[PDB]
From Swiss-Prot, chain A:
Plays a role in pre-mRNA splicing as core component of precatalytic, catalytic and postcatalytic spliceosomal complexes, both of the predominant U2-type spliceosome and the minor U12-type spliceosome. Functions as a scaffold that mediates the ordered assembly of spliceosomal proteins and snRNAs. Required for the assembly of the U4/U6-U5 tri-snRNP complex, a building block of the spliceosome. Functions as a scaffold that positions spliceosomal U2, U5 and U6 snRNAs at splice sites on pre-mRNA substrates, so that splicing can occur. Interacts with both the 5' and the 3' splice site. Widely expressed. It comes from the Eukaryota. It comes from Homo sapiens (Human). It is linked to Retinitis pigmentosa 13: A retinal dystrophy belonging to the group of pigmentary retinopathies. Retinitis pigmentosa is characterized by retinal pigment deposits visible on fundus examination and primary loss of rod photoreceptor cells followed by secondary loss of cone photoreceptors. Patients typically have night vision blindness and loss of midperipheral visual field. As their condition progresses, they lose their far peripheral visual field and eventually central vision as well. The MPN (JAB/Mov34) domain mediates interaction with TSSC4 and SNRNP200. Has structural similarity with deubiquitinating enzymes, but lacks the residues that would bind the catalytic metal ion. It is found in: Nucleus; Nucleus speckle. This is Pre-mRNA-processing-splicing factor 8.
Swiss-Prot record, chain B:
Required for pre-mRNA splicing as component of the spliceosome, including pre-catalytic, catalytic and post-catalytic spliceosomal complexes. Component of the U5 snRNP and the U4/U6-U5 tri-snRNP complex, a building block of the spliceosome. As a component of the minor spliceosome, involved in the splicing of U12-type introns in pre-mRNAs. The chain holds residues 824 to 898 of 972 of the full protein. It is linked to Mandibulofacial dysostosis with microcephaly: A rare syndrome characterized by progressive microcephaly, midface and malar hypoplasia, micrognathia, microtia, dysplastic ears, preauricular skin tags, significant developmental delay, and speech delay. Many patients have major sequelae, including choanal atresia that results in respiratory difficulties, conductive hearing loss, and cleft palate. Belongs to the TRAFAC class translation factor GTPase superfamily. Classic translation factor GTPase family. EF-G/EF-2 subfamily. This is 116 kDa U5 small nuclear ribonucleoprotein component. Component of the U5 snRNP and the U4/U6-U5 tri-snRNP complex, a building block of the spliceosome. The U4/U6-U5 tri-snRNP complex is composed of the U4, U6 and U5 snRNAs and at least PRPF3, PRPF4, PRPF6, PRPF8, PRPF31, SNRNP200, TXNL4A, SNRNP40, DDX23, CD2BP2, PPIH, SNU13, EFTUD2, SART1 and USP39. Component of the pre-catalytic, catalytic and post-catalytic spliceosome complexes. Component of the minor spliceosome, which splices U12-type introns. Within this complex, interacts with CRIPT. Interacts with ERBB4 and PRPF8. Interacts with PIH1D1. It is found in: Nucleus.
From Swiss-Prot, chain C:
Belongs to the DEAD box helicase family. DDX23/PRP28 subfamily. The phosphorylated form (by SRPK2) is a component of the U4/U6-U5 tri-snRNP complex composed of the U4, U6 and U5 snRNAs and at least PRPF3, PRPF4, PRPF6, PRPF8, PRPF31, SNRNP200, TXNL4A, WDR57, SNRNP40, DDX23, CD2BP2, PPIH, SNU13, EFTUD2, SART1 and USP39. Identified in the spliceosome C complex. Interacts with ERBB4. Interacts with ERCC6. Disulfide bonds: none annotated. Involved in pre-mRNA splicing and its phosphorylated form (by SRPK2) is required for spliceosomal B complex formation. Independently of its spliceosome formation function, required for the suppression of incorrect R-loops formed during transcription; R-loops are composed of a DNA:RNA hybrid and the associated non-template single-stranded DNA. In vitro phosphorylated by CLK1 and U1 snRNP-associated protein kinase. Phosphorylated by SRPK2 and this phosphorylation is required for its association with the tri-snRNP (U4/U6-U5 tri-small nuclear ribonucleoproteins) and subsequent spliceosomal B complex formation. May be phosphorylated by SRPK2 on Ser residues in the SR domain; the phosphorylation is required for the removal of inappropriate R-loops during transcription. The chain holds residues 254 to 379 of 820 of the full protein. It comes from the Eukaryota. This is Probable ATP-dependent RNA helicase DDX23. It is found in: Nucleus; Chromosome.
Amino acid sequence: PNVVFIKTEDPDLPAFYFDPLINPISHREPLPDDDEEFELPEFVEPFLKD
Amino acid sequence: TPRLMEPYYFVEVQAPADCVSAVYTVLARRRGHVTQDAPIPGSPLYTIKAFIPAIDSFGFETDLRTHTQGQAFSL
Amino acid sequence: YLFVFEWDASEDTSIDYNPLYKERHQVQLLGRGFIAGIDLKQQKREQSRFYGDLMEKRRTLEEKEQEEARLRKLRKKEAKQRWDRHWSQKKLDEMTDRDWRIFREDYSI
Amino acid sequence: IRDVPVLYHITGAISFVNEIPWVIEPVYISQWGSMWIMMRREKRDRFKRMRFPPFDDEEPPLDYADNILDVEPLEAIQLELDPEEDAPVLDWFYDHQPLRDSRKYVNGSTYQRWQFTLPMMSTLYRLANQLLTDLVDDNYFYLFDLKAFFTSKALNMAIPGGPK
């Protein structure tokens, strides 16, 4: 399969960046209502946010 | 007035941004025509959708993968 | 359907009269990959000059200035590097000992 | 200079070297790539080839104790090695056996196994860019690899560009 690795030429750019050799994605589901309020406990965090 | 009929294959070619013109060059001699050329969203590759005579499709994949340095692939 | 230290030209292969195989259409690899050893400026001169148009079409309007600033930094590094000229365009007070040794080598003394 | 062990006979009949030239492979490739860059630099800047066999047929070979022993040699071939980018590789790039007395990187004095850190590998991959191709996959070498060459051997044909 075609390795689609694209080389980085500028060190001042961020490591994860939308390099515009990649073609642009064209833009445009059972979403529940906000009234059935689900609440997380306060110590719940996303992983590795620090 | 009886006539004959031959089978036509559908061809999709996955190629980089410059080899597409080489694909147009290769398909020019096997009595084919390119119907669709579409960029893949979220990827730097293109898709070429075409028809070819099946009697002309002998060695077609080897022609593409030799003329395009093995980069383009076709089914 | 039906002794010789050189190599002879009759031992050669790839003598094929095909329009597909003489012009084999080598890759340039997204304008980023380079063939090793062959000079990088000469490879940038002999390119198809097609992906540069795709860059200057699809870069952001600030990214043309970013590309120009990166090229100015690269030219600054090249000017710091060259500050290795030939002795015909240099002066006497700036002519280092390596340059005098190459000047002695030029006239076979 | 290079200092090697020597096995020798009691009367000087024969003299041996008794050392295997072990090197670390990416360091070795990076060092020869730096040589390639410096010699391209030297031919684009500067040639007089040396005159072969220098010592004539009637004179003996030179005595080491009187002519080479106290003469300091000339400057070798070394790249500049910019201290900002080449900082993890600066203290060991042109040694005889690099990082030999370091317990972090080389297993010991026999110089057999090595392990490196990732910015060091980044630097050694950056300096060796002239000797390495830009290939990323095996979609290259299509009908130009060992199995296709063995097939052309068994079928007695010639690949365009391939051997006969």
